[PDB]
Amino acid sequence: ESADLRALAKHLYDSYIKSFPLTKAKARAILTGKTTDKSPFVIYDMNSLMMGEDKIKFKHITPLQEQSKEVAIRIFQGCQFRSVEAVQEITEYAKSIPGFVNLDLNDQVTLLKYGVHEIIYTMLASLMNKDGVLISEGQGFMTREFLKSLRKPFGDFMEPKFEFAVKFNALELDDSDLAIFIAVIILSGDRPGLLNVKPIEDIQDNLLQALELQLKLNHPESSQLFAKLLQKMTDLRQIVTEHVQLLQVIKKTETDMSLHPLLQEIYKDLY
Ligand SMILES: Cc1oc(-c2ccccc2)nc1CCOc1ccc(C[C@@H]2SC(=O)NC2=O)c2sccc12
Ligand SMILES: Cc1oc(-c2ccccc2)nc1CCOc1ccc(C[C@@H]2SC(=O)NC2=O)c2sccc12
Ligand SMILES: CCCCCCCCC(=O)O
Known part of the structure; x- marks a missing residue:
C-alpha cells in the first residue's frame, strides 16, 4: 500500500539526515556562490594547493611515516579519508534500513563491504560539477583540470568519477531521492x-517500490527516471571494478605505498 511506502521513504530520509552531515542540498548551496555564507578556496595548481593547505583546516592526520611531500599522494590521502568517514556514516545509515539488522551478521558485513564504494561514488557526485569538486567539507574547491593533470595514473583516478558525476547529476535527484537509492544499493x-x-x-x-513511488511523486516530468537511475548502478559498478584494478597497478609501481587500514580491510578480497 502507498501509505507504508511513503512512511518508509520518510523514515529513510530522516535516517540519511542523521547519518550524513554533508548533504547534497548543503553541497549545492556551497557550489552556487550566490549563497555567500563563505566561499571555498579554489585549488588549481601546486601553489594554490600549498596555499589551500594553509587556509583549510584538516580534520584527519596521516601517520608521519606515511606523509609524502608529493602533491598527488597528499590528494590521494585526502580522498581516502573521505572514504573512511563515509564508511562509518554508511554503516550507521544501514542499521536503520528496516530488516537489515535482523540479517545474518556475515551477510550484513558482505553487503557493507561491497556496497560502500558504490555509495561513496554516488554521493561524491553530490560534491562535483563539470569544473571541480568540493573538498574538506566544502572549505575548498579543487578544479577538474588540475585533477586531470596528475602524474603516474592519478588522472585515471579522478576523471572517470567526474564523467560519471556530470551525467548522474543531470538526473537532478535530491537527498530524499538519494536516501532510498543508496538503500537499494546496500540491499543487493x-x-x-x-x-x-x-x-x-x-x-x-x-525498497524498490518505495523508490519508484518517490520518483513518480517527486519528479513527475522526468520520463523513465526510475529506469535511468537503476541503470546508473551499472556505471557505478564499473567505476568500482576499474578502480580496484587500477589500485592493483599502483601497488606494483610503489611497494611501500599505503592505504588507510580501513580501506585495506574493505579492498581485501574485493573482486
Ligand atoms: C589515521 C590514519 O591514517 C592512516 C593512513 C592514511 C592514509 C594513508 C595511509 C595511512 N593510517 C591511520 C592510522 C594510524 O595512524 C597513526 C598511527 C600511529 C601514529 C604515531 C606514530 S607516527 C608514525 O608514523 N608511526 C607512530 O607510531 C600516528 S600520529 C597520527 C596518526 C598516527
Ligand atoms: C579529489 C579530492 O581531494 C580531496 C582532498 C585533497 C586534499 C586535502 C583534502 C581533501 N578531496 C577530494 C574529494 C574526494 O574525492 C574522492 C573521495 C573518495 C574516493 C575513493 C577513495 S580513494 C581510493 O583509492 N579508495 C577510496 O575509497 C575518491 S576516488 C577519486 C576521488 C575520490
Ligand atoms: C595529506 C596532506 C594533507 C591533506 C590530508 C587531508 C585529510 C583531512 C581532510 O581534509 O579530510
Whole structure:
C-alpha cells in the first residue's frame, strides 16, 4: 500500500539526515556562490594547493611515516579519508534500513563491504560539477583540470568519477531521492558470498517500490527516471571494478605505498 511506502521513504530520509552531515542540498548551496555564507578556496595548481593547505583546516592526520611531500599522494590521502568517514556514516545509515539488522551478521558485513564504494561514488557526485569538486567539507574547491593533470595514473583516478558525476547529476535527484537509492544499493542480492539471498531480495523489493513511488511523486516530468537511475548502478559498478584494478597497478609501481587500514580491510578480497 502507498501509505507504508511513503512512511518508509520518510523514515529513510530522516535516517540519511542523521547519518550524513554533508548533504547534497548543503553541497549545492556551497557550489552556487550566490549563497555567500563563505566561499571555498579554489585549488588549481601546486601553489594554490600549498596555499589551500594553509587556509583549510584538516580534520584527519596521516601517520608521519606515511606523509609524502608529493602533491598527488597528499590528494590521494585526502580522498581516502573521505572514504573512511563515509564508511562509518554508511554503516550507521544501514542499521536503520528496516530488516537489515535482523540479517545474518556475515551477510550484513558482505553487503557493507561491497556496497560502500558504490555509495561513496554516488554521493561524491553530490560534491562535483563539470569544473571541480568540493573538498574538506566544502572549505575548498579543487578544479577538474588540475585533477586531470596528475602524474603516474592519478588522472585515471579522478576523471572517470567526474564523467560519471556530470551525467548522474543531470538526473537532478535530491537527498530524499538519494536516501532510498543508496538503500537499494546496500540491499543487493548479487554480492559475492552471501548466505541467505532471499531475505535480502525481499527487503530490496520493498525498497524498490518505495523508490519508484518517490520518483513518480517527486519528479513527475522526468520520463523513465526510475529506469535511468537503476541503470546508473551499472556505471557505478564499473567505476568500482576499474578502480580496484587500477589500485592493483599502483601497488606494483610503489611497494611501500599505503592505504588507510580501513580501506585495506574493505579492498581485501574485493573482486
Ligand atoms: C589515521 C590514519 O591514517 C592512516 C593512513 C592514511 C592514509 C594513508 C595511509 C595511512 N593510517 C591511520 C592510522 C594510524 O595512524 C597513526 C598511527 C600511529 C601514529 C604515531 C606514530 S607516527 C608514525 O608514523 N608511526 C607512530 O607510531 C600516528 S600520529 C597520527 C596518526 C598516527
Ligand atoms: C579529489 C579530492 O581531494 C580531496 C582532498 C585533497 C586534499 C586535502 C583534502 C581533501 N578531496 C577530494 C574529494 C574526494 O574525492 C574522492 C573521495 C573518495 C574516493 C575513493 C577513495 S580513494 C581510493 O583509492 N579508495 C577510496 O575509497 C575518491 S576516488 C577519486 C576521488 C575520490
Ligand atoms: C595529506 C596532506 C594533507 C591533506 C590530508 C587531508 C585529510 C583531512 C581532510 O581534509 O579530510
